[PDB]
Amino acid sequence: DSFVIRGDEVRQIAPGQTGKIADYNYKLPDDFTGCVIAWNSNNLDSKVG
Amino acid sequence: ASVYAWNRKRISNCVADYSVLYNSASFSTFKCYGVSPTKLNDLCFTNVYA
């Protein structure tokens, strides 16, 4: 499962977490099995405008 | 207030919609000890002290 968020919301990508992303965007199960990988993409996804 | 003179505010006789707080991503740290934030909307407290 691939997507993009902001750094403050990286914590929300985990079982049993709350917030905008977890509640309304992407929710992991409490018994989730698997790995979560996240890395900065400022050089790629940011624009001057 | 300064940490050495941290301010204490008493909260009482009001409805506390904590969702507005824990939903907003602005907060970088949100950690509840002895409580789960989801249950905050379904709970009542006696001496609330910010």
Query: How far apart (Å, rounded) are the C-alpha atoms in residues B39 and A27?
Result: 18
Query: How far apart (Å, rounded) are the C-alpha atoms in residues A24 and B14?
Result: 27
* Residue B48, beta-bridge partner list: B11
The per-residue b/e assignment along A12-47, b for 16 or more CB within 10 angstroms, e otherwise, is: bbeeebbbebbeeeeebeeeeeeeeeeeeeeeeeee
Instruction: Quickly count: other Cβ atoms within 10 Å of residue B32's Cβ.
Output: 13
Which residues in chain A are closer than 8 Å to B23, comparing Cβ atoms? 18-20, 23
Which residues in chain B are closer than 8 Å to A18, comparing Cβ atoms? 22-23, 37-38
Q: Is B15 left (phi over 0), alpha (psi -120 to 50) or beta?
A: beta
Token pair recorded at residue A33: 């099995």
Strands, E assignment, chain B: 10-11, 48-49
Q: What is the resolution of this structure in A?
A: 2.8
Yes or no, beta carbons of A8 and B26 under 8 Å apart: yes
Please give the distance of CA A23 from its chain centroid, rounded to a whole number.
Answer: 12
| Experimental technique used to determine this entry | cryo-EM
